[PDB]
Structure 1
């Protein structure tokens, strides 16, 4: 019950004890593994205090003041505040710690070696969509940093009764619109067809291009959401060209520099932050493999192979694989040439292996979701393919939450 994990390429063996601190549940049982399910299926005053005590217990341990002076004081203080108000407010130091460790604990995240460098922006004093917009613009400008990207999170006021939730209705702060055509096919990003519909169904006048940055749809204190246009000078974009094939720039492709997830929920000490946009920088395959080549997305593999004059009549010519590689060489070359931070899947997975070693050494483990850590191309020539990983849920954490337009009383 002190588990071991082995790397089959190097025979490195790590022992995991961290998992015994795990609290929440995975969805698996002894009779069935759900490890490939995408998304496995307010607080009463009672269950809130054990949540706060457990979080405070680990916070004060991390500063080497467990069972100390201030620890028992803070424990009493939070105890008192809950019985009366049926919630409590985090100190700044605890908010920063809680956010860094939600990332540290994100078992699907390969870029976690950077976890302790996160820049945490407290936006708990915000009251309106306009203020939200202002916090978000400042986040975007800070994180972009003229292409020298910096990790950042901005944390909006916590849930109170579920009627006054702060929510960013976009799934990412920067995404391209998607339009359905009269002739069935889809122009732009197919993932965002419904969201693009809501924005137009809200007032947005769409340019109807293939790369239209979506407006922000911001909801403060449970009110109706409001549209906002992110100033273009804050949306850093990269035109995609290839280091060998000059015809590549003619394809008219680009992508944005800043990946900023905005629809997740951040859980710290039992408190729920339903608007907490966070951003880092891209691994190349996220754009080149998934965004560009998923059949349900931009699905560009047909055009690239054609302009490569590859025999596309048999799958066994591996023309898709061959095209896929070139696209991803192009994304990397484009960002690197424009001095925008990006990491290739070989470097990021190699760093994650080093990060696992560190976590096993200094923390006793590292929860990790193999199905999501292995890149979606060239899996077995990356070190994470040959790495056994234990997956388990730790708190603080990021969780999924319902889309607001299915829930909001409009």
Structure 2
């Protein structure tokens, strides 16, 4: 039951007891490990145990476990589910829940910051125009002129499943992708489907390479509506290299604010289907993945050519050399414009310190090694040498289907 994890660099061993609190499942079995697979309404009876589980942890956290206040609240919530088939979180509960969903996020390397999350309560929102206003305020607060601050905005919880709030966008800020007559993709290929959805809904696409997508927002189960984020709220950084003057001529830029907007927040059985959240970038996210994935901007060959590397044979490591340079450029560009960014060395070192804190004060830290180890220079970061246990605690952030696959278009 009590599991040990070893760091093979430092020989430090930690003991995990926290995994014994996971109710949810991993996709693995005793015979098969699915650790590398990307993706392996509640009835009344379903809901009270989940609410109770949550309220017990909440009341424990504030040192009032078993108190009258604790028991009073369970009964109140119990009576509310019984009567209304659902319930409403107190503001203190919502804030605790969202922070803990971040705390429990096994794939997030930035969790040392978890207790500092700014939670914006948008549960009073009723319309798409209201959603747009809440989202601009989030973008402006979080961006903070380049001195980024973590934040989440929480729209109304699911009820009957036919009045869901959703941000159709996968992040608040992303670039369009356009399939071309000549077979190629212009822009970001990751966003081709969603861009088409915007167009057929009305968007007049500019048809460039770095077109900030419009917001497509769904309130109360209604058909979604298009809105443009004030251009002046979208902070971008042009990418240059401190040594190569030709780099700026590649014409590359990226946006400062990473804001995942397609996930579902579960707190105490309640489901928050629209819950955009933001932090700040780790450099490799943009320089390794967004820029060098073959299926993304796929820029390695172009960069390698401008560096005049020998690209006749893989064993010259021309791909590897170009990769480091692209990532050097990304960090230098964000730092020079005073936009918060963390490099993979600093971020992984912080995470190892966070793990140790969590093991000491909480009995463990769920971590997905496949996601925590950066996509370049893996073994020269400390996380590579750290064994991790992956398990699922709630409150949690969950994947959910894209809404265009399930939306019944009212028309």
Shift of 1:288: 0.2
Give the match's secondary structure for 1:263: coil
Rounded to whole Å, the distance in 1 between the matches of 2:39 and 2:193 is 20
Who is 1:6 aligned against? Answer: 6
RMSD: 0.4
C-alpha distance in 1, partners of 2:300/2:344? 20
* Rounded Cα–Cα distance in structure 2 between residues aligned with 1:222 and 1:315: 52
CA–CA distance in 1 between the matches of 2:84 and 2:206?
Answer: 48
SS for the counterpart of 2:265 is: strand
Q: TM-score, normalised by structure 1?
A: 0.99
1:384 Cα deviation after fit: 0.2
Query: Displacement, 1:167?
Result: 0.2
Cα deviation 1:67-101 (Å, max 9, x = unaligned)? 01210010110010000101000000000000000
Distance 2:200 2:292 in 1: 29
**Following TM superposition, by how much is the alpha carbon of 1:65 offset from its aligned partner in structure 2, in angstroms?**
0.5
Q: How many angstroms apart in 1 are the aligned matches of 2:144 and 2:406?
A: 35
> 1 CA distance for matches of 2:34 and 2:177?
32
Q: Aligned equivalents of 2:199 and 2:384: distance in 1?
A: 43
Paired with 2:217 and 2:315, the residues of 1 have a C-alpha distance of 48
TM-score, structure 2 as length reference: 0.99
Query: Once the 2 structures are TM-superposed, how far is the Cα of residue 122 of structure 1 from its aligned partner?
Result: 0.3
What number of residue pairs does the alignment pair up? 409
Q: What does 1:285-296 align with in structure 2 at a 5 Å threshold?
A: 285-296=284-295
Q: CA shift at 1:222, angstroms? A: 0.7
SS in 1 for 2:152: strand
- Mapped partners of 2:70, 2:302: distance in 1: 62
**Deviation sequence 1:237-294 (CA, Å, 0-9, x none):** 0000001001111110000000000000000000000000000000000000000000
Deviation at 1:199, TM superposition (A): 0.6
Alignment of 1:167-182 (within 5 A): 167-182=166-181
Q: What is the alpha-carbon distance in structure 1 between the residues aligned to residue 344 and residue 23 of structure 2?
A: 31
Q: Find the residue that maps to 2:342 and give its secondary structure.
A: coil
Q: CA deviation at 1:310?
A: 0.6
Please show how residues 303-382 of structure 1 align to structure 2 within 5 Å.
Answer: 303-382=302-381
Note the 1:3-402 alignment, pairs <5 A.
3-40=3-40, 42-402=41-401
Deviation at 1:409, TM superposition (A): 0.5
Deviations 1:327-351 (A, max 9, x none): 0000000000000000000000000
Aligned residue for 1:97, secondary structure, equals: helix
TM-aligned CA deviation for residue 198 of structure 1:
0.6
SS of corresponding position for 2:281? coil
SS in 2 for 1:385: helix
2:385 partner SS: coil
CA–CA separation in structure 2 for the residues paired with 1:198 and 1:321? 37
Describe the superposition over 1:116-144 as per-residue Cα deviations: whole angstroms up to 9, x where unpaired. Answer: 00000000000000000000000000000
Unpaired segments of 5 or more residues in structure 1? Answer: none
The Cα of 1:299 is off from its aligned counterpart by: 0.0
Distance 2:311 2:206 in 1: 34
Cα distance in 2 for residues equivalent to 1:386 and 1:280: 26
In structure 1, how many angstroms separate the alpha carbons of the residues matched to 2:240 and 2:282? 17
Give the drift of 1:399. 0.2
Shift of 1:313: 1.2
**Alignment deviations for residues 150-203 of structure 1 (CA, whole Å, 9 cap, x no partner):** 000000000001100000000000000001110101000000001111111111
Structure 1 consecutive aligned stretches of length 4 or more whose deviation exceeds 2 Å: none
Q: Deviations over 1:289-323 (max 9, x none)?
A: 00000000000001000000011111111111100
